[PDB]
Amino acid sequence: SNAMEQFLDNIKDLEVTTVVRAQEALDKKETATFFIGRKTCPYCRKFAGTLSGVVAETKAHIYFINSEEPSQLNDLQAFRSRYGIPTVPGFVHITDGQINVRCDSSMSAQEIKDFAGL
Numbered sequence: 001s002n003a004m005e006q007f008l009d010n011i012k013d014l015e016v017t018t019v020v021r022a023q024e025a026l027d028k029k030e031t032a033t034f035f036i037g038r039k040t041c042p043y044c045r046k047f048a049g050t051l052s053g054v055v056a057e058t059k060a061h062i063y064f065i066n067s068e069e070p071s072q073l074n075d076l077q078a079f080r081s082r083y084g085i086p087t088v089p090g091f092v093h094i095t096d097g098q099i100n101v102r103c104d105s106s107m108s109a110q111e112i113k114d115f116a117g118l
Contacts, residue, residue, distance in 0.1 A: 018075065058113065
């Protein structure tokens with residue numbers, strides 16, 4: 001749909017990756033932030049609009065994980081189960097071996113910046 005195409009535009013400057021890359025950030029004590037969601041969900045689309053603006057404003061590097069990528073089905077299931085992400089959108093901030101998860105499509109620009117340490 002037109003709205004899904006707007007989603008693809010909104011996420012154009014996010015870096016597509018997988019849950020394995022998030023686990024690497026945990027294990028290596030890296031700081032990295034991930035938006036996990038799907039273009040097909042209106043709440044993911046709302047969140048992606050807000051996030052898009054934050055990325056444009058800050059020039060931040062934030063990752064995107066497609067929560068319905070066919071080739072990633074059981075890795076996604078396992079990660080979402082292990083880290084408590086039963087709905088999308090999910091916003092995941094990893095730093096110093098610690099993971100923080102928020103599943104709330106309404107997060108404001110400031111809340112997003114606060115959460116991602118921007």
